[PDB]
Amino acid sequence: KQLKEKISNIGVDCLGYGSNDMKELFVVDPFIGKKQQILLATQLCRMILKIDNVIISGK
Amino acid sequence: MNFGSQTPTIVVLKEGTDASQGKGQIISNINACVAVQEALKPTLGPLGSD
């Protein structure tokens, strides 16, 4: 659907409504909040992948 | 004349003091530096690892 139509506010309806268009379902999120999910994730995983030596001193 | 039954010999260095002669120790010192060197071997370069 999203490849066909350019309207980009259709997602997964979890409450079981008959229509997936989110204009009528009253759901809104901030841009700064959804952006930080990608930024803090992709910036952390760079650090996770760059570890080769892993030394853990037993307590 | 003697004070007692026997008299054990004195160790020159203190008991537990490690010491060694020959070319074995300097090779061990070089191998010790190479052991520390191998930890930082793949770290060198832009594509290195933390």
XYZ file of all heavy atoms in Angstrom:
815
model
N 0.816 -1.209 0.000
C 0.000 0.000 0.000
C 0.852 1.263 0.000
O 0.592 2.178 -0.789
C -0.935 -0.003 1.213
C -1.996 1.092 1.205
C -2.934 0.953 2.394
C -3.981 2.056 2.424
N -3.384 3.404 2.641
N 1.860 1.335 0.871
C 2.691 2.527 0.964
C 3.528 2.755 -0.287
O 3.860 3.905 -0.592
C 3.604 2.430 2.192
C 4.246 3.748 2.635
C 3.248 4.740 3.201
O 3.066 5.829 2.657
N 2.599 4.370 4.299
N 3.878 1.691 -1.013
C 4.556 1.863 -2.293
C 3.614 2.436 -3.344
O 4.051 3.191 -4.220
C 5.132 0.522 -2.760
C 5.982 0.488 -4.038
C 7.243 1.327 -3.893
C 6.336 -0.949 -4.392
N 2.324 2.095 -3.271
C 1.350 2.599 -4.233
C 0.953 4.037 -3.916
O 1.161 4.940 -4.735
C 0.122 1.684 -4.247
C -0.906 2.007 -5.323
C -2.020 0.974 -5.336
C -3.049 1.273 -6.412
N -4.148 0.269 -6.417
N 0.388 4.266 -2.732
C -0.082 5.578 -2.310
C 1.021 6.328 -1.574
O 1.835 5.734 -0.863
C -1.310 5.448 -1.405
C -2.510 4.794 -2.071
C -3.714 4.715 -1.151
O -3.609 5.174 0.006
O -4.763 4.195 -1.584
N 1.032 7.650 -1.749
C 2.018 8.515 -1.112
C 1.648 8.918 0.312
O 2.510 9.435 1.030
C 2.220 9.783 -1.951
C 2.805 9.533 -3.331
C 2.969 10.833 -4.103
C 3.583 10.600 -5.474
N 3.726 11.867 -6.244
N 0.405 8.704 0.738
C -0.024 9.085 2.080
C 0.664 8.158 3.077
O 0.539 6.932 2.983
C -1.555 9.020 2.215
C -2.234 10.100 1.355
C -1.979 9.190 3.675
C -3.678 9.785 0.988
N 1.376 8.751 4.040
C 2.270 8.041 4.950
C 1.831 8.141 6.409
O 2.658 8.436 7.279
C 3.696 8.568 4.789
O 3.781 9.938 5.144
N 0.540 7.923 6.688
C 0.009 7.850 8.047
C -0.845 6.599 8.265
O -1.848 6.652 8.986
C -0.776 9.126 8.375
C -1.852 9.452 7.348
O -2.341 8.582 6.628
N -2.225 10.724 7.281
N -0.464 5.481 7.645
C -1.121 4.185 7.803
C -0.120 3.249 8.466
O 1.017 3.112 7.995
C -1.604 3.625 6.453
C -2.585 4.617 5.800
C -2.206 2.207 6.631
C -1.954 5.524 4.756
N -0.539 2.609 9.562
C 0.295 1.718 10.337
C -0.494 0.526 10.851
O -1.557 0.179 10.332
N 0.051 -0.095 11.893
C -0.506 -1.322 12.457
C -1.572 -0.947 13.477
O -1.272 -0.320 14.500
C 0.591 -2.187 13.100
C -0.026 -3.431 13.756
C 1.658 -2.570 12.064
N -2.816 -1.337 13.203
C -3.923 -1.132 14.127
C -3.956 -2.286 15.121
O -4.299 -3.417 14.757
C -5.248 -1.036 13.371
C -6.434 -0.846 14.294
O -6.559 0.249 14.884
O -7.241 -1.789 14.430
N -3.607 -1.997 16.377
C -3.482 -3.019 17.409
C -4.766 -3.251 18.194
O -4.974 -4.365 18.687
C -2.365 -2.642 18.387
S -0.764 -2.371 17.597
N -5.623 -2.241 18.322
C -6.873 -2.375 19.058
C -7.968 -3.095 18.274
O -9.049 -3.321 18.829
C -7.379 -0.992 19.482
C -6.486 -0.183 20.430
C -7.020 1.236 20.566
C -6.372 -0.848 21.797
N -7.729 -3.452 17.012
C -8.686 -4.230 16.251
C -9.757 -3.428 15.549
O -10.846 -3.956 15.301
N -9.485 -2.168 15.218
C -10.440 -1.375 14.462
C -10.496 -1.845 13.011
O -9.585 -2.509 12.507
C -10.073 0.108 14.518
C -10.357 0.757 15.852
C -9.367 0.864 16.820
C -11.615 1.266 16.143
C -9.624 1.458 18.040
C -11.882 1.861 17.361
C -10.883 1.955 18.306
O -11.142 2.547 19.520
N -11.589 -1.490 12.337
C -11.785 -1.888 10.956
C -10.984 -1.109 9.935
O -10.766 -1.625 8.834
N -10.543 0.104 10.277
C -9.767 0.969 9.395
C -8.385 1.194 9.989
O -8.249 1.438 11.193
C -10.467 2.317 9.188
O -9.712 3.156 8.331
N -7.366 1.120 9.132
C -5.975 1.315 9.529
C -5.502 2.761 9.380
O -4.392 3.082 9.819
C -5.050 0.380 8.735
C -5.121 0.594 7.223
O -5.868 1.440 6.730
N -4.342 -0.188 6.486
N -6.305 3.639 8.777
C -5.937 5.042 8.657
C -5.947 5.691 10.035
O -6.960 5.657 10.740
C -6.902 5.765 7.716
C -6.479 7.196 7.421
O -5.340 7.577 7.762
O -7.295 7.943 6.839
N -4.817 6.290 10.408
C -4.625 6.847 11.742
C -5.099 8.293 11.871
O -4.941 8.887 12.943
C -3.150 6.739 12.132
C -2.699 5.307 12.359
S -1.015 5.165 12.979
C -0.956 3.409 13.321
N -5.676 8.878 10.816
C -6.294 10.193 10.956
C -7.497 10.137 11.891
O -7.737 11.075 12.660
C -6.713 10.729 9.584
C -5.584 11.385 8.787
C -5.193 12.758 9.335
C -3.782 12.757 9.894
N -3.410 14.095 10.430
N -8.254 9.039 11.846
C -9.466 8.880 12.640
C -9.226 8.254 14.009
O -10.090 8.381 14.883
C -10.483 8.024 11.875
C -10.932 8.617 10.546
C -11.945 7.743 9.833
O -12.293 6.672 10.372
O -12.393 8.128 8.732
N -8.089 7.588 14.224
C -7.840 6.850 15.458
C -7.250 7.698 16.581
O -7.113 7.189 17.699
C -6.906 5.665 15.181
C -7.315 4.680 14.081
C -6.249 3.607 13.921
C -8.668 4.042 14.364
N -6.898 8.963 16.324
C -6.394 9.881 17.352
C -5.095 9.368 17.981
O -5.038 9.065 19.175
C -7.449 10.139 18.433
C -8.774 10.607 17.896
C -9.817 9.714 17.713
C -8.981 11.942 17.591
C -11.039 10.144 17.227
C -10.200 12.376 17.104
C -11.229 11.476 16.922
N -4.053 9.262 17.156
C -2.716 8.863 17.592
C -1.704 9.817 16.965
O -1.701 10.020 15.745
C -2.414 7.388 17.240
C -2.442 7.121 15.730
C -1.078 6.947 17.833
N -0.880 10.437 17.812
C 0.144 11.394 17.397
C 1.364 11.172 18.280
O 1.222 10.893 19.475
C -0.343 12.858 17.507
C 0.789 13.834 17.154
C -1.571 13.103 16.620
N 2.573 11.283 17.683
C 3.858 11.153 18.363
C 4.780 12.317 17.985
O 4.595 12.926 16.926
C 4.537 9.831 17.991
C 3.643 8.633 18.226
O 2.989 8.580 19.287
O 3.590 7.749 17.346
N 5.783 12.655 18.803
C 6.681 13.755 18.442
C 7.785 13.297 17.499
O 8.123 12.114 17.414
C 7.258 14.191 19.791
C 7.331 12.938 20.561
C 6.172 12.075 20.107
N 8.353 14.272 16.786
C 9.443 13.978 15.861
C 10.759 13.784 16.603
O 11.583 12.950 16.209
C 9.572 15.100 14.832
C 10.721 14.921 13.881
C 10.638 14.019 12.836
C 11.884 15.661 14.031
C 11.694 13.851 11.959
C 12.940 15.499 13.158
C 12.847 14.593 12.121
N 10.977 14.547 17.676
C 12.209 14.417 18.447
C 12.251 13.072 19.169
O 13.331 12.517 19.404
C 12.351 15.607 19.422
C 13.781 15.732 19.972
C 11.362 15.495 20.583
C 14.802 16.245 18.966
N 11.086 12.525 19.528
C 11.056 11.237 20.199
C 11.331 10.072 19.271
O 12.115 9.180 19.610
N 10.698 10.057 18.098
C 10.926 8.979 17.144
C 12.305 9.070 16.501
O 12.854 8.047 16.079
C 9.838 8.995 16.064
C 9.732 7.719 15.221
C 9.123 6.562 16.005
C 8.915 5.340 15.131
N 8.431 4.183 15.931
N 12.876 10.274 16.412
C 14.212 10.418 15.843
C 15.265 9.794 16.752
O 16.176 9.108 16.274
C 14.520 11.895 15.597
C 15.842 12.150 14.879
C 16.002 13.603 14.449
C 16.196 14.536 15.636
N 16.511 15.926 15.206
N 15.151 10.010 18.065
C 16.157 9.523 19.003
C 16.209 8.001 19.083
O 17.228 7.457 19.520
C 15.897 10.097 20.397
C 16.249 11.567 20.547
C 17.738 11.803 20.726
O 18.559 10.942 20.415
N 18.090 12.976 21.239
N 15.138 7.306 18.693
C 15.174 5.848 18.645
C 16.201 5.362 17.631
O 16.914 4.381 17.873
C 13.788 5.299 18.307
C 12.755 5.501 19.399
C 11.418 4.876 19.052
O 11.171 4.512 17.902
N 10.550 4.744 20.047
N 16.294 6.043 16.486
C 17.227 5.630 15.439
C 18.633 6.129 15.753
O 19.622 5.425 15.516
C 16.735 6.124 14.062
C 15.486 5.348 13.625
C 17.827 5.966 12.988
C 14.604 6.092 12.643
N 18.750 7.346 16.291
C 20.068 7.930 16.519
C 20.801 7.220 17.650
O 21.959 6.816 17.496
C 19.943 9.425 16.823
C 19.335 10.351 15.762
C 19.318 11.783 16.289
C 20.079 10.267 14.430
N 20.147 7.061 18.803
C 20.801 6.398 19.926
C 21.014 4.911 19.661
O 21.922 4.308 20.244
C 19.988 6.602 21.204
C 19.785 8.044 21.683
C 18.824 8.079 22.859
C 21.106 8.702 22.065
N 20.199 4.303 18.793
C 20.394 2.898 18.449
C 21.575 2.721 17.503
O 22.462 1.895 17.751
C 19.120 2.327 17.830
N 21.603 3.486 16.408
C 22.664 3.320 15.420
C 24.013 3.802 15.940
O 25.053 3.293 15.505
C 22.303 4.047 14.117
O 23.192 3.630 13.073
C 22.394 5.562 14.271
N 24.023 4.768 16.863
C 25.265 5.235 17.467
C 25.782 4.295 18.547
O 26.999 4.231 18.754
C 25.069 6.634 18.059
C 24.846 7.743 17.024
C 26.081 8.062 16.198
O 26.056 7.977 14.971
N 27.164 8.440 16.867
N 24.899 3.569 19.238
C 25.349 2.581 20.211
C 25.949 1.368 19.512
O 27.053 0.930 19.856
C 24.188 2.155 21.117
C 24.531 1.277 22.335
C 25.297 2.073 23.386
C 23.292 0.647 22.961
N 25.236 0.821 18.521
C 25.651 -0.391 17.822
C 26.995 -0.250 17.119
O 27.668 -1.263 16.905
C 24.590 -0.796 16.795
S 24.664 0.137 15.252
N 27.393 0.969 16.745
C 28.761 1.190 16.292
C 29.752 0.850 17.396
O 30.788 0.223 17.141
C 28.938 2.640 15.842
C 30.188 2.899 15.007
C 30.681 4.323 15.180
N 29.612 5.303 14.997
C 29.062 5.636 13.830
N 29.447 5.075 12.685
N 28.099 6.546 13.809
N 29.452 1.255 18.632
C 30.329 0.919 19.746
C 30.283 -0.569 20.060
O 31.312 -1.153 20.414
C 29.946 1.726 20.987
C 31.013 1.715 22.076
S 30.657 2.821 23.455
C 29.223 2.027 24.176
N 29.112 -1.198 19.933
C 28.988 -2.620 20.247
C 29.770 -3.457 19.243
O 30.388 -4.467 19.604
C 27.503 -3.044 20.289
C 26.677 -2.203 21.288
C 27.390 -4.543 20.593
C 27.124 -2.257 22.744
N 29.760 -3.056 17.970
C 30.455 -3.806 16.932
C 31.966 -3.622 16.970
O 32.693 -4.517 16.525
C 29.931 -3.394 15.553
C 28.504 -3.823 15.196
C 28.001 -3.037 13.994
C 28.426 -5.322 14.924
N 32.457 -2.497 17.488
C 33.886 -2.213 17.515
C 34.631 -2.918 18.650
O 35.858 -2.792 18.727
C 34.113 -0.701 17.605
C 33.857 0.038 16.296
C 33.843 1.559 16.470
C 35.229 2.146 16.730
N 36.163 1.969 15.584
N 33.939 -3.648 19.524
C 34.586 -4.405 20.591
C 35.096 -5.716 20.006
O 34.342 -6.443 19.348
C 33.623 -4.671 21.762
C 33.075 -3.366 22.371
C 34.302 -5.544 22.823
C 34.113 -2.382 22.913
N 36.377 -6.007 20.240
C 37.005 -7.282 19.907
C 37.492 -8.012 21.147
O 37.158 -9.188 21.339
C 38.174 -7.051 18.935
C 38.521 -8.289 18.124
O 38.282 -9.416 18.606
O 39.035 -8.131 16.998
N 38.266 -7.341 21.999
C 38.762 -7.911 23.247
C 37.775 -7.589 24.364
O 37.367 -6.433 24.520
C 40.148 -7.361 23.573
C 41.170 -7.690 22.503
O 40.816 -7.972 21.358
N 42.445 -7.656 22.870
N 37.397 -8.612 25.131
C 36.383 -8.509 26.180
C 36.953 -9.155 27.433
O 36.956 -10.388 27.550
C 35.063 -9.191 25.777
C 34.070 -9.169 26.936
C 34.441 -8.541 24.540
N 37.407 -8.327 28.373
C 38.007 -8.771 29.630
C 37.039 -8.401 30.746
O 36.644 -7.234 30.868
C 39.392 -8.141 29.862
C 40.411 -8.695 28.859
C 39.883 -8.403 31.292
C 41.563 -7.757 28.577
N 36.660 -9.396 31.548
C 35.710 -9.242 32.648
C 36.389 -9.762 33.907
O 36.609 -10.972 34.044
C 34.392 -9.991 32.375
C 33.640 -9.350 31.196
C 33.511 -10.056 33.647
C 33.176 -10.356 30.162
N 36.716 -8.854 34.823
C 37.335 -9.235 36.084
C 36.276 -9.732 37.058
O 35.375 -8.988 37.455
C 38.087 -8.050 36.691
O 38.685 -8.405 37.926
N 36.388 -11.004 37.437
C 35.427 -11.590 38.350
C 35.504 -10.980 39.738
O 36.576 -10.817 40.320
N 34.335 -10.643 40.273
C 34.239 -10.027 41.590
C 34.406 -11.074 42.686
O 34.875 -10.770 43.783
C 32.896 -9.308 41.744
C 32.779 -8.453 42.996
C 31.503 -7.629 42.980
C 31.407 -6.728 44.199
N 30.196 -5.864 44.158
N 82.273 -26.991 70.528
C 82.604 -25.679 69.904
C 81.384 -25.115 69.191
O 81.095 -23.922 69.282
C 83.765 -25.829 68.919
C 84.968 -24.946 69.224
S 84.684 -23.196 68.883
C 84.676 -23.182 67.089
N 80.673 -25.984 68.480
C 79.466 -25.580 67.781
C 78.309 -25.441 68.768
O 78.303 -26.037 69.848
C 79.117 -26.591 66.690
C 78.229 -26.002 65.612
O 77.328 -25.212 65.895
N 78.485 -26.379 64.365
N 77.317 -24.638 68.376
C 76.214 -24.323 69.280
C 75.188 -25.452 69.329
O 74.522 -25.644 70.354
C 75.527 -23.014 68.857
C 76.419 -21.772 68.876
C 76.012 -20.643 68.184
C 77.619 -21.709 69.584
C 76.781 -19.495 68.176
C 78.388 -20.564 69.577
C 77.969 -19.457 68.875
N 75.038 -26.202 68.232
C 74.001 -27.213 68.131
C 74.336 -28.367 67.209
O 75.494 -28.557 66.825
N 73.315 -29.149 66.866
C 73.449 -30.385 66.081
C 73.987 -30.030 64.695
O 75.087 -30.495 64.351
C 72.108 -31.107 66.108
O 72.112 -32.242 65.261
N 73.276 -29.234 63.894
C 73.681 -28.871 62.541
C 73.497 -27.374 62.326
O 72.969 -26.660 63.182
C 72.896 -29.673 61.484
C 71.444 -29.242 61.165
C 70.515 -29.275 62.365
O 70.909 -29.668 63.461
N 69.269 -28.867 62.157
N 73.949 -26.919 61.161
C 73.979 -25.499 60.806
C 73.600 -25.345 59.330
O 74.465 -25.541 58.454
C 75.368 -24.920 61.091
O 75.965 -25.628 62.183
C 75.256 -23.471 61.476
N 72.349 -25.034 58.969
C 72.018 -24.932 57.542
C 72.634 -23.700 56.897
O 72.787 -22.644 57.515
C 70.487 -24.857 57.533
C 70.137 -24.289 58.843
C 71.142 -24.853 59.800
N 72.982 -23.852 55.621
C 73.643 -22.792 54.875
C 72.701 -21.611 54.652
O 71.474 -21.749 54.638
C 74.148 -23.316 53.527
O 74.999 -22.334 52.920
C 72.987 -23.627 52.575
N 73.299 -20.434 54.474
C 72.571 -19.191 54.239
C 72.329 -19.070 52.741
O 73.242 -19.299 51.937
C 73.335 -17.963 54.764
C 73.444 -17.976 56.296
C 72.644 -16.663 54.309
C 74.607 -17.147 56.841
N 71.100 -18.708 52.370
C 70.826 -18.240 51.018
C 71.257 -16.783 50.926
O 70.985 -15.982 51.832
C 69.337 -18.412 50.671
C 69.080 -18.073 49.190
C 68.870 -19.837 51.004
N 71.949 -16.434 49.839
C 72.496 -15.086 49.706
C 71.372 -14.067 49.566
O 71.276 -13.120 50.355
C 73.476 -15.020 48.519
C 73.974 -13.584 48.321
C 74.648 -15.992 48.728
N 70.509 -14.243 48.571
C 69.325 -13.411 48.430
C 68.271 -13.831 49.456
O 68.349 -14.899 50.068
C 68.762 -13.506 47.008
C 69.397 -12.664 45.888
C 69.187 -11.170 46.122
C 70.879 -12.971 45.710
N 67.278 -12.966 49.647
C 66.192 -13.265 50.568
C 65.364 -14.436 50.049
O 65.296 -14.692 48.842
C 65.302 -12.036 50.759
C 64.364 -12.121 51.954
C 63.631 -10.807 52.177
C 62.748 -10.866 53.413
N 62.016 -9.589 53.636
N 64.742 -15.159 50.978
C 63.922 -16.310 50.622
C 62.704 -15.848 49.831
O 61.927 -15.013 50.307
C 63.497 -17.064 51.880
C 62.840 -18.412 51.609
C 62.546 -19.185 52.880
O 62.794 -18.645 53.978
O 62.065 -20.333 52.781
N 62.546 -16.391 48.623
C 61.483 -16.010 47.715
C 61.857 -14.973 46.675
O 61.001 -14.612 45.858
N 63.098 -14.485 46.670
C 63.550 -13.516 45.680
C 63.892 -14.250 44.389
O 64.774 -15.116 44.377
C 64.762 -12.739 46.196
O 64.416 -12.055 47.406
C 65.238 -11.725 45.160
N 63.198 -13.901 43.309
C 63.384 -14.550 42.018
C 64.563 -13.906 41.297
O 64.692 -12.677 41.281
C 62.112 -14.441 41.176
C 62.189 -15.238 39.883
O 63.128 -16.048 39.722
O 61.303 -15.054 39.022
N 65.422 -14.738 40.710
C 66.578 -14.272 39.959
C 66.966 -15.332 38.942
O 66.745 -16.526 39.166
C 67.761 -13.968 40.885
N 67.540 -14.895 37.821
C 67.930 -15.807 36.757
C 69.022 -15.167 35.912
O 69.045 -13.947 35.723
C 66.734 -16.184 35.876
O 67.120 -17.067 34.839
N 69.920 -16.012 35.406
C 71.026 -15.627 34.538
C 70.763 -16.132 33.122
O 69.812 -16.876 32.867
C 72.348 -16.184 35.079
C 72.759 -15.656 36.454
C 73.099 -14.175 36.457
O 72.512 -13.398 37.207
N 74.061 -13.783 35.628
N 71.621 -15.710 32.194
C 71.568 -16.190 30.828
C 70.635 -15.383 29.948
O 70.051 -14.369 30.343
N 70.500 -15.862 28.712
C 69.674 -15.205 27.705
C 68.188 -15.534 27.830
O 67.398 -15.042 27.017
C 70.159 -15.591 26.303
C 71.571 -15.108 25.958
C 72.314 -16.091 25.050
C 72.863 -17.309 25.802
N 73.904 -16.961 26.812
N 67.783 -16.348 28.809
C 66.382 -16.708 28.926
C 65.511 -15.591 29.462
O 64.346 -15.469 29.071
N 66.056 -14.760 30.355
C 65.249 -13.714 30.976
C 64.975 -12.576 30.001
O 63.851 -12.065 29.938
C 65.947 -13.193 32.235
C 65.089 -12.293 33.138
C 63.937 -13.032 33.797
O 63.993 -14.244 33.996
N 62.880 -12.300 34.133
N 65.988 -12.158 29.238
C 65.790 -11.083 28.272
C 64.859 -11.507 27.142
O 64.168 -10.655 26.570
C 67.143 -10.594 27.719
C 66.989 -9.235 27.024
C 67.754 -11.613 26.758
C 68.301 -8.642 26.556
N 64.817 -12.799 26.807
C 63.834 -13.286 25.844
C 62.446 -13.281 26.472
O 61.448 -12.985 25.805
C 64.229 -14.687 25.330
C 65.496 -14.613 24.458
C 63.076 -15.323 24.527
C 66.225 -15.942 24.284
N 62.357 -13.611 27.764
C 61.076 -13.558 28.458
C 60.577 -12.125 28.581
O 59.370 -11.871 28.491
C 61.201 -14.202 29.839
O 61.593 -15.559 29.737
N 61.491 -11.175 28.789
C 61.103 -9.769 28.836
C 60.621 -9.289 27.473
O 59.657 -8.520 27.385
C 62.275 -8.919 29.322
C 62.683 -9.245 30.744
O 62.273 -10.263 31.302
N 63.495 -8.381 31.339
N 61.281 -9.729 26.400
C 60.851 -9.352 25.057
C 59.515 -10.005 24.730
O 58.627 -9.372 24.146
C 61.940 -9.715 24.025
C 63.168 -8.805 24.184
C 61.407 -9.605 22.586
C 64.459 -9.403 23.656
N 59.345 -11.276 25.103
C 58.071 -11.950 24.874
C 56.956 -11.346 25.719
O 55.788 -11.385 25.318
C 58.206 -13.444 25.165
C 59.136 -14.148 24.194
O 59.249 -13.762 23.032
N 59.807 -15.190 24.671
N 57.291 -10.791 26.886
C 56.286 -10.106 27.693
C 55.793 -8.844 26.998
O 54.592 -8.548 27.014
C 56.858 -9.772 29.070
N 56.704 -8.087 26.383
C 56.299 -6.902 25.634
C 55.515 -7.273 24.382
O 54.569 -6.568 24.014
C 57.526 -6.071 25.262
S 58.350 -5.290 26.670
N 55.891 -8.369 23.716
C 55.144 -8.819 22.546
C 53.753 -9.292 22.953
O 52.794 -9.150 22.184
C 55.929 -9.919 21.799
C 55.066 -10.589 20.723
C 57.191 -9.340 21.160
N 53.614 -9.863 24.154
C 52.295 -10.251 24.641
C 51.401 -9.036 24.855
O 50.205 -9.086 24.548
C 52.427 -11.048 25.938
N 51.962 -7.943 25.375
C 51.211 -6.696 25.485
C 51.021 -6.067 24.109
O 50.023 -5.378 23.860
C 51.919 -5.732 26.459
C 51.208 -4.374 26.484
C 51.994 -6.341 27.867
N 51.974 -6.284 23.196
C 51.870 -5.727 21.851
C 50.699 -6.323 21.079
O 50.021 -5.603 20.337
C 53.178 -5.963 21.094
C 53.321 -5.177 19.799
C 54.625 -5.476 19.086
O 55.385 -6.350 19.502
N 54.891 -4.750 18.009
N 50.447 -7.626 21.237
C 49.383 -8.287 20.489
C 47.997 -7.769 20.854
O 47.080 -7.868 20.032
C 49.443 -9.799 20.719
C 50.612 -10.496 20.030
C 50.440 -10.620 18.523
O 49.414 -10.146 17.990
O 51.336 -11.196 17.872
N 47.820 -7.226 22.061
C 46.537 -6.634 22.420
C 46.250 -5.384 21.598
O 45.098 -5.152 21.212
C 46.509 -6.305 23.911
N 47.278 -4.582 21.318
C 47.152 -3.347 20.553
C 47.456 -3.515 19.065
O 47.451 -2.517 18.338
C 48.080 -2.275 21.140
C 47.887 -1.908 22.616
C 48.998 -0.977 23.077
C 46.526 -1.269 22.855
N 47.721 -4.739 18.590
C 48.000 -4.960 17.174
C 46.789 -4.646 16.294
O 46.905 -3.794 15.403
C 48.482 -6.395 16.926
C 49.986 -6.590 17.086
C 50.755 -6.106 15.863
C 52.252 -6.327 16.015
N 52.615 -7.772 16.031
N 45.622 -5.277 16.478
C 44.488 -4.962 15.599
C 43.830 -3.618 15.873
O 42.973 -3.202 15.086
C 43.512 -6.113 15.874
C 43.766 -6.475 17.266
C 45.243 -6.308 17.470
N 44.197 -2.929 16.956
C 43.615 -1.622 17.239
C 44.148 -0.552 16.290
O 43.461 0.439 16.020
C 43.897 -1.235 18.692
O 43.383 -2.247 19.567
C 43.254 0.100 19.036
N 45.365 -0.731 15.775
C 45.981 0.287 14.934
C 45.264 0.384 13.593
O 45.099 -0.619 12.891
C 47.463 -0.034 14.721
C 48.320 0.940 13.896
C 48.343 2.321 14.530
C 49.740 0.421 13.727
N 44.831 1.600 13.253
C 44.284 1.922 11.953
C 42.868 2.458 12.051
O 42.226 2.339 13.100
N 42.343 3.064 10.973
C 40.950 3.543 11.021
C 39.928 2.435 11.183
O 38.917 2.647 11.866
C 40.772 4.259 9.675
C 42.137 4.551 9.204
C 42.973 3.413 9.684
N 40.159 1.267 10.583
C 39.254 0.128 10.685
C 39.556 -0.753 11.904
O 39.000 -1.852 12.023
C 39.297 -0.684 9.383
C 38.357 -0.197 8.269
C 38.708 1.206 7.789
C 38.356 -1.162 7.092
N 40.389 -0.283 12.837
C 40.694 -1.043 14.028
C 39.499 -1.169 14.953
O 38.438 -0.582 14.738
N 39.698 -1.953 16.012
C 38.666 -2.305 16.977
C 39.023 -1.757 18.353
O 40.197 -1.659 18.723
C 38.490 -3.826 17.052
O 39.718 -4.465 17.356
N 37.989 -1.404 19.110
C 38.165 -0.930 20.473
C 38.450 -2.101 21.409
O 38.302 -3.271 21.043
C 36.924 -0.172 20.946
C 36.640 1.065 20.115
O 37.588 1.619 19.519
O 35.466 1.487 20.061
